[PDB]
Amino acid sequence: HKIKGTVVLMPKNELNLNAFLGRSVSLQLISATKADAHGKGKVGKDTFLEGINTSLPTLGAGESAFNIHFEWDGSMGIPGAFYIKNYMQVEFFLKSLTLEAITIRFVCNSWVYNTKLYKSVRIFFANHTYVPSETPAPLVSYREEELKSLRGNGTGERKEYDRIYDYDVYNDLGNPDKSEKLARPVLGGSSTFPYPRRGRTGRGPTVTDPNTEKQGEVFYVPRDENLGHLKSKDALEIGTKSLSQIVQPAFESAFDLKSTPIEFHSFQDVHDLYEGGIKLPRDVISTIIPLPVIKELYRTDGQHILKFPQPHVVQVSQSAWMTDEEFAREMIAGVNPCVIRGLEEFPPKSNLDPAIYGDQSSKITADSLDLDGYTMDEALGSRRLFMLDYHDIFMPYVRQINQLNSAKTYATRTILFLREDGTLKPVAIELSLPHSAGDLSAAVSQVVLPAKEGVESTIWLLAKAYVIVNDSCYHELMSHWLNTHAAMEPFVIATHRHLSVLHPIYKLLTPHYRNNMNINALARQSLINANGIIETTFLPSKYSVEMSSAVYKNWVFTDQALPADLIKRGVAIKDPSTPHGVRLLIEDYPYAADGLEIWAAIKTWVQEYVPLYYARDDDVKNDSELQHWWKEAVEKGHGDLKDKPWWPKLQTLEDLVEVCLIIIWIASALHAAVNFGQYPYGGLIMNRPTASRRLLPEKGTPEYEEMINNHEKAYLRTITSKLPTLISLSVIEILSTHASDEVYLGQRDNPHWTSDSKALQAFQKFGNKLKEIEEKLVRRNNDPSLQGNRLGPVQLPYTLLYPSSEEGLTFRGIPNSISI
């Protein structure tokens, strides 16, 4: 007559026991088979926790188990859900409920605040999976009501305990109330600035601008999106806030007080950062050393020294980054390996308006290029010509960026030749500047060719620097921020707003959203905000984020699929006779080759999962939640692009597979590939400069003479200054770190996420496949014939797409989601 249940929870101080007893916590089971006069599952009596269970060893993570028994006669049917009310003042983290001999499992993993804070009682369902048409009739209304609850009403200031998911534009980055200089255009909701939506917070208008959301000490995210951590060192996402608000000011004072040289004077001054370290004022070290996360960033003598970790890129050769070989190799195996494109005609063309920027014809001449004996026509025809083209992307912003004090850039284009040995070599760099009548600047565009000696070698080195500044900016704002963090949030919101926790697609996709809204919210507050980390360390300054909006104009969901991307960029061609359906034009393109393996593994997984819940196309078209989910994801989440024809319709099994496959790819492998190499490659500022401060010098000037006499100083004066470098290195170190509680691809935070053994078996195969894939990539990295592109002169094995990783700054490991 009684159902024995076990409640596992975590007291707030983990992320005593006895206080949970008495009438502190009550649970009411809900029948999925027996309904009341309204068709709603019958609800049992309030049952309180009875005592502390201390039986099964399998119970870690500061978790505690509680015995409880429910008065549930077989006449009440089978329990399929349950209500829970917390009478204690402090919230606790509910892990799960297990009902024995009837076993029924509930995976909750949710914060339960005091009952008085909730409009309706917290409800949790058993781990069964149901498309809408399969929902037991007694749970149907509870299913839709919980979704209605999750959607809220689009109004109100969100509170810490709310679990309300909604959309809003990026109108919370500027800080006009503090200063007109901190005013920023609203990104999203206009044709001028289209942009993915983000999680609604509702703080209200600023005093000076009704279109901009006022500042807030805490940027809200639905409660369960804010991941707690057993180990403070794992709360990596809070690092950005501490860095911007506490550490950055401390660094600045050291410079304002002239306690450390304002500029790096030689490359060794930069290498010093991870060798002997940098000596800073005691009160500066004292301000940093006690902060969680931040303190894991540097070794210190506790008094004056801060030592950064040695970046992977210099671990074997501290000078290899300067080679043309590495410069080109990082375009296919570096931090930003997905921008290079095939070049099929010569010279490269521009779609920009010459009336505005001046004649846009390229000044690169074919006869000036060293293509290893190949003629231009031969290189073009054999598909050996490629380019890293930032000309059209940057040109529209060069004038405004260059009007800034201490910022000067070129819209660059780099031509690459695929040598017969399979490696890429850079053969020319065009440094373009806009030209319009009345220009005050005498600076002109120019082409720089490879050179190993003399001032020509310095000019070529600086040319590579201007290119990588373009690339770092594009990598951070587009490849990384826009394409992963920002593009994914809309889908997270829609999933919670329209797919029930019961829905198979919810279970398939949500693991790939872990910590995404959380890091994004913290990003809006300290990373991409007016005068935030990115604006204060990257070239575009106050134009940074709006540049990503301009790029978003051309963002295409279906082109995020890896095969489509490779084909679109001209680095692969459709080839039905191949395993992946595409033939790579650069056969040893690490990112793409390893990527296709992961892509295929995810595809197989999705294709094996969907069939378990959708027998035919009609079953997809007729899933009400799924249709509302996709419709909102598109028309609201990415609403500024709802008019585009390429959006899948989601009326077929094929379409569902495609959409889920792309979402999973972006959240896991794509993000991992562009994220975890940030410090490994960019930890040496010379290798990944984030900004450039001056254009090439005119012959006959002291600056030109410096290029001849002190090329390292010329280089350092051109790239990111020492102060912003310290800040940027710290943020990318944080962002390249894997928390020890990360959940990787092929893993789930709970083995009982679904009761369906079929889905569970498919997932297990997916995991074994990923392990199988890793062995293969290891073999690729150990293959001497692939050393040129997979390791390079920096001898850094390409491990960014290895599925697994231990915690730390490992340069490998694919998390399920955009978690940092």
Give the count of beta carbons closer than 10 Å to the beta carbon of residue 229.
17
Give the count of beta carbons closer than 10 Å to the beta carbon of residue 351.
7
DSSP β-bridge partners for residue 170: 187
For tokens 């790819």, name the residue: 665
Residue nearest to Fe ion (CB): 675
Collapse the DSSP code of 459 into the 3-class scheme (helix H, G, I; strand E, B; otherwise coil) and give the result. Answer: helix
Catalytic annotation present for 336: no
Query: What does the DSSP 8-state code read for residue 247?
Result: I
Q: What is the smallest separation between the CB atom of 532 and Fe ion, expressed in angstroms? A: 15
Q: What is the smallest separation between the CB atom of 360 and Fe ion, expressed in angstroms? A: 34
Q: What is the smallest separation between the CB atom of 485 and Fe ion, expressed in angstroms? A: 6
Count of residues touching Fe ion (by CB under 5 A): 1
391 is in an annotated binding site: no
- Residues 504 and 522: beta-carbon distance below 8 Å: no
Token representation of residue 304: 């004056």
Distance, in Å, from the CA atom of 233 to the CA atom of 237, rounded to the nearest integer, reads 10
Report the residue number, 675 or 816, with the smaller CB distance to Fe ion: 675
According to CB under 5 A, which residues from 365 to 394 bind Fe ion? none
Stretch that binds Fe ion, among 108-116, 163-171, 459-467, 667-675 (CB under 5 A): 667-675
Q: For residue 337, is the peptide bond before it cis, meaning its omega torsion is within 30 degrees of 0?
A: no
Report the residue number, 675 or 789, with the smaller CB distance to Fe ion: 675
Q: What is the smallest separation between the CB atom of 819 and Fe ion, expressed in angstroms? A: 8
Distance, in Å, from the CA atom of 63 to the CA atom of 674, rounded to the nearest integer, reads 35
Closest CA to 42 of 13, 10, 9, 72: 72
Q: Which of 271, 312, 580, 671 is catalytic?
A: 671
Q: What is the smallest separation between the CB atom of 672 and Fe ion, expressed in angstroms? A: 9
Report the residue number, 542 or 738, with the smaller CB distance to Fe ion: 738
Stretch that binds Fe ion, among 20-28, 490-498, 671-679, 711-719 (CB under 5 A): 671-679
Report the residue number, 529 or 675, with the smaller CB distance to Fe ion: 675
Token representation of residue 17: 């026991």
Q: Does 819 bind Fe ion (CB under 5 A)?
A: no
Report the residue number, 139 or 814, with the smaller CB distance to Fe ion: 814
DSSP β-bridge partners for residue 425: 417
Q: For residue 354, is the peptide bond before it cis, meaning its omega torsion is within 30 degrees of 0?
A: no
According to CB under 5 A, which residues from 674 to 693 bind Fe ion? 675
Q: What is the smallest separation between the CB atom of 199 and Fe ion, expressed in angstroms? A: 16
Q: Which of 171, 516, 520, 675 is catalytic?
A: 675
First to last CA, the chain: 49
675 is in an annotated binding site: yes
Report the residue number, 7 or 547, with the smaller CB distance to Fe ion: 547
Catalytic annotation present for 485: yes
Q: What is the smallest separation between the CB atom of 38 and Fe ion, expressed in angstroms? A: 47
Q: Which of 475, 485, 638, 738 is catalytic?
A: 485
Q: Which of 312, 475, 480, 711 is catalytic?
A: 480
Stretch that binds Fe ion, among 73-81, 673-681, 724-732, 749-757 (CB under 5 A): 673-681
Closest CA to 28 of 105, 122, 148: 122
485 is in an annotated binding site: yes
Rounded to 10 degrees, the C-alpha dihedral 79/80/86/87 comes to -30
Three-state SS letters, 271-304:
HHHHCCCEECCHHHHHHHCCCCCHHHHCEECCCC
Three-state SS letters, 161-216:
CCCCCCEECECCCCCCCCCHHHCCCCECCCCCCCCCCEECCCCCECCCCCCCECCC
DSSP β-bridge partners for residue 30: 43, 81
Give the count of beta carbons closer than 10 Å to the beta carbon of residue 146.
21
Report the residue number, 662 or 673, with the smaller CB distance to Fe ion: 673
671 is in an annotated binding site: yes
The residues annotated with a catalytic role in the active site are: 480, 485, 671, 675, 820
Query: Binding site membership for Fe cation: which residues?
Result: 480, 485, 671, 675, 820
Binding positions for Fe ion, rule: CB under 5 A: 675
Query: Binding site membership: which residues?
Result: 480, 485, 671, 675, 820
